[PDB]
Design a protein around this ligand. Sequence first.
Ligand SMILES: C[C@@H](Oc1ccc(Oc2cnc3cc(Cl)ccc3n2)cc1)C(=O)O
Ligand SMILES: C[C@@H](Oc1ccc(Oc2cnc3cc(Cl)ccc3n2)cc1)C(=O)O
Ligand SMILES: C[C@@H](Oc1ccc(Oc2cnc3cc(Cl)ccc3n2)cc1)C(=O)O
Ligand SMILES: C[C@@H](Oc1ccc(Oc2cnc3cc(Cl)ccc3n2)cc1)C(=O)O
Ligand SMILES: O=C(O)CCC(=O)C(=O)O
Ligand SMILES: O=C(O)CCC(=O)C(=O)O
Ligand SMILES: O=C(O)CCC(=O)C(=O)O
Ligand SMILES: O=C(O)CCC(=O)C(=O)O
Ligand SMILES: [Cl-]
Ligand SMILES: [Cl-]
Ligand SMILES: [Co+2]
Ligand SMILES: [Co+2]
Ligand SMILES: [Co+2]
Ligand SMILES: [Co+2]
Lengths: 285, 286, 285, 286
Amino acid sequence: KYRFIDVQPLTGVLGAEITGVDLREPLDDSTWNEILDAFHTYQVIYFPGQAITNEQHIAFSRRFGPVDPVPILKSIEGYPEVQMIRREANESSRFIGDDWHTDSTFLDAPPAAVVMRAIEVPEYGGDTGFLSMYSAWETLSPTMQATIEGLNVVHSATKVFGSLYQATNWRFSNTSVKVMDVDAGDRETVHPLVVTHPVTGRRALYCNQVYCQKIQGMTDAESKSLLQFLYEHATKFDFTCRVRWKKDQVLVWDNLCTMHRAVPDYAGKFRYLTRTTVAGDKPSR
Amino acid sequence: NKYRFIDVQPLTGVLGAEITGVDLREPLDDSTWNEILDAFHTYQVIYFPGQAITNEQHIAFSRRFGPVDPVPILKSIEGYPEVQMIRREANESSRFIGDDWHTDSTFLDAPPAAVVMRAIEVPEYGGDTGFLSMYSAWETLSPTMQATIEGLNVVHSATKVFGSLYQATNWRFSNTSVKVMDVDAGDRETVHPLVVTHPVTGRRALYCNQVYCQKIQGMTDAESKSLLQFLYEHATKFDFTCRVRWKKDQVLVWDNLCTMHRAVPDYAGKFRYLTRTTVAGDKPSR
Amino acid sequence: KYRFIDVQPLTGVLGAEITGVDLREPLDDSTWNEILDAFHTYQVIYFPGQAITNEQHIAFSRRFGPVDPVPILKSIEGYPEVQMIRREANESSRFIGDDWHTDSTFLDAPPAAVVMRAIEVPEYGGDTGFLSMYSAWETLSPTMQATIEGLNVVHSATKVFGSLYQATNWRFSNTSVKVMDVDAGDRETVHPLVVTHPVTGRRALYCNQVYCQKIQGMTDAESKSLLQFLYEHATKFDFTCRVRWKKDQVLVWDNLCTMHRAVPDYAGKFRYLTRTTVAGDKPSR
Amino acid sequence: NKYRFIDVQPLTGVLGAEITGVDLREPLDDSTWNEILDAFHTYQVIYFPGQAITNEQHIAFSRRFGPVDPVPILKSIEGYPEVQMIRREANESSRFIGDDWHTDSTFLDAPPAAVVMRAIEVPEYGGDTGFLSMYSAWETLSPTMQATIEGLNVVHSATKVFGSLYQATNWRFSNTSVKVMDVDAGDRETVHPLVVTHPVTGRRALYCNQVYCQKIQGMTDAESKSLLQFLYEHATKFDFTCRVRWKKDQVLVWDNLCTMHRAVPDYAGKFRYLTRTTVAGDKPSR
Ligand SMILES: C[C@@H](Oc1ccc(Oc2cnc3cc(Cl)ccc3n2)cc1)C(=O)O
Ligand SMILES: C[C@@H](Oc1ccc(Oc2cnc3cc(Cl)ccc3n2)cc1)C(=O)O
Ligand SMILES: C[C@@H](Oc1ccc(Oc2cnc3cc(Cl)ccc3n2)cc1)C(=O)O
Ligand SMILES: C[C@@H](Oc1ccc(Oc2cnc3cc(Cl)ccc3n2)cc1)C(=O)O
Ligand SMILES: O=C(O)CCC(=O)C(=O)O
Ligand SMILES: O=C(O)CCC(=O)C(=O)O
Ligand SMILES: O=C(O)CCC(=O)C(=O)O
Ligand SMILES: O=C(O)CCC(=O)C(=O)O
Ligand SMILES: [Cl-]
Ligand SMILES: [Cl-]
Ligand SMILES: [Co+2]
Ligand SMILES: [Co+2]
Ligand SMILES: [Co+2]
Ligand SMILES: [Co+2]
């Protein structure tokens, strides 16, 4: 069915490799329409072998929507919108993003999408996992769905760069991570536990252990119990795929309907990807 | 306190009350009965020490609470089909009856409303019964959690007690107090709401128990297990419980809709014998 | 079998009422020997109807061992060793001791025992629960016992009056609780997970959720998992008893082989008991 | 890297490797075989894309790893009792074979040492197999936790797969690939250590799986459940896993002692067919 690009789905759940296109060149309307369709169908799409410039990265990201950096990451000099996920070979700090999450959900309007490009990565190690929150939602019984669909969740960055972060002893390195204001870390926002994607109209479960503090209105014990069940459910191996990186692979993921995590199995090896983030609207039900 | 015809001594700040100043061998005037019924509705489990009543007076007093109807599983005393036994011979090595939190016979389309239990001969110590309030278990859920669960129903059956799950496992009750039952009666399912309204007080109570509840209707096995596990942990917190110690001729009534109870098995090697008459109820409803 | 006192066990597991003795008077050797035997047998013993003076309380406690206040509680004026568990009718703060624990196990040598006396208590509400850690230990399989008997646990007061306490929003009232130094709150000690009682020689499980931070040498996830199973096991209703208070009831509990908790079911009612604490040796295996 | 006769491309930093530069239709010289065996021991699961071998060459290549012996439950291809099928017709609505973390046939006194699996016809996408390293699951337990558990043994049986627990439940495998089995063979127990030493590498591996492990020997049901649940959660973290995608004529070998695997059921409605020969092992030991 695709005529302007070649798409090879990665699993029966999510993920697709796209080839037959050169992202260094402008895309005609037909080629862009297929790309966007593949992005909305497969949720995480990746293009091996795209030796693009940083400006081309920026422009390509702009096709998905307004570009706008996430609060915590350092950017390359000359490009505030091009942020780094960079780990030096000798680092001993915590690996960025090494549990399931989606990005910056403590924001009133988290990103819609992220476009990541491998600069220099290990021959093996440092895969990124993804999973579908559409599948997590769809595999809940209708009874379970009706039960939880009216709930909201309180999100904040407290464990990442607020008071809880300051409490613990593990730190990120300053290679890619900025020093942040503690109160900014502890500012709370509220999102729906079940969101409707604004383009596809499909529903997705929307919670993550990194930023979700509690179910709004619940006791700590009620909220901890529901959220724990939902995390176990959503992170079943069945709902995941695994993306392996090579130099100049460019990947886009939908930040509303997927979760992702870094795999820290390359200790002692240099790894560097850049990324631009695409702004989103307020998550809504 | 407000009581003028009976003396009531509440047992904890959550449920339970001792009632004295009354002789259950004699008939009760309307004034004394109304206060007893009121104390039953206010305290959920009430008990009357020192009541040396006959089996017939036990039956008659039970009847004041509602029609009397034995539960399926228990043997009864000779000459009194309505008076059933909770009896454990000293030597027994079988499972102790009722030794986890439950309420009685909820596999029935219409479980009992109440039970009236009377001590015949019990150990100097050991063999207390614990009780907890399902009004309190419900009221301490957040308004959010209440709204979340109030439309759910739960499938109950006796499969673990005298159905296929019972037949599959190794432990048994002795035949001292427990009849042989049909396996299909054991496996027969009924559905009740997760949250019920008491037909007299109008108050709401959480309604689930691990002995007879199989699953939340319409949910997957893992969803149901996970929610019911949380509710069991919530309702069985020590703060919601009271503990009743038995003495010969103590007579006790519990509300079988808004409480749970469990036997404490801490008297192995000692004889224990209580009788009970069960008072019938209506379909639990929302 | 008791000839100098009358003892009435409370449950088949632990607990005993003692009568037939006047604690306002000196005890002969025979009466004291029976008291101590009952204390070692039943683990928590209580004497209704003992209108004693504070000095008599102190002296009676001294028969069990050296007396020595616990760090957190305020004492009555004129008697540093007589501490208060006092809640005013109008209080809205956290109830002292409202989860299962044993006292001050963050100390290198926690108390051996505590002697508590009711001054003024509600007609109903404010029971104290107790449970036996001998029974908790004895109902573990031999295989489970051999598995865990070599483990140690790190204890500290951090959740009660150290950094974790400072983090949260709930506070105890200053009615009975002193302001404490944070570092004193966070000082760690190490005890055996399975201790041998120094008088009876019987073994007891020794862990509590209030002061135990983690199994020494374990990861956070391993330790949280074992300790959770042990707490669920030890706090089964089967292992508990419940003590109801009346004015001038004097009770002694063994602080090594039991746990206890306050029951907060008297909101809006005044409740006041005093207590002296009896010093112990370093818990050992 | 150190390899001079084969090209090996590791799959993740934990386990798994692709091997190219070799034609399994031809015999392997000692030098090429030694490197393959070494890569098997180093990477635990290895796979060879593009190997259009006959069933006989499949059998012969398997044999290089150890004596070949079919597992009890799977049907075999006509004319090759040692070559068993993992085959799912497009229309099937039965349970997917192997769809949770396990290692093969651990109810046996001596489970297989390895399996060699070959894709005949598989979906364009969907039907990957996941693998994880039980060396890594063991090595990431603290020294304290290791000392704690290293003396324990676990009781295994096939009761959930083709024993009484299977017969009691509702789901079934189809008869496409699965034989009817004797219920008593299903319920027969064996005991293995919780922590095993690999008989060639000498390295230690955690050894438990939820499909066949019933309980820690000597423990109570609640103790065993609670410890095994923790170990399952620990060993199945995403960080310890790799995922293999299948293509026609890919041939893959896994170590059945130091890994676990699971089928991913994400291809309903599509035909999938792999064959496999199982290589026999010795009693797992400490
Ligand atoms: C860029 C990105 O920022 C991060 C940074 C790190 C991150 O990964 C984790 C994983 N586990 C964590 C666990 C704890 Cl207890 C605390 C913090 C944790 N952080 C997730 C998102 C974002 O969101 O845009
Ligand atoms: C009279 C009464 O009958 C019983 C009998 C026993 C009973 O107690 C338990 C407790 N835990 C159990 C656990 C399992 Cl796996 C099986 C059976 C169990 N039975 C609860 C009710 C009733 O309801 O009228
Ligand atoms: C006198 C006594 O001091 C206390 C004071 C309070 C206490 O009770 C609790 C119960 N649950 C708690 C829960 C949390 Cl998260 C924190 C603190 C908690 N404290 C236990 C012991 C002692 O030990 O001698
Ligand atoms: C060939 C292989 O055979 C099987 C077949 C199926 C299998 O997969 C599962 C997964 N989860 C299961 C869960 C339950 Cl409750 C029951 C049976 C289950 N079976 C695991 C091994 C073997 O070992 O040789
Ligand atoms: O390094 C990775 O694979 C992903 C890190 C991540 O979570 C992120 O960039 O937001
Ligand atoms: O023996 C007891 O204390 C209670 C037994 C019980 O559960 C019952 O009679 O239903
Ligand atoms: O108030 C109570 O019943 C007990 C409080 C307590 O834990 C203590 O005094 O140590
Ligand atoms: O189908 C698969 O991917 C693996 C099935 C499996 O578990 C097995 O063959 O033992
Ligand atoms: Cl009647
Ligand atoms: Cl052979
Ligand atoms: Co991220
Ligand atoms: Co009962
Ligand atoms: Co205390
Ligand atoms: Co298998």
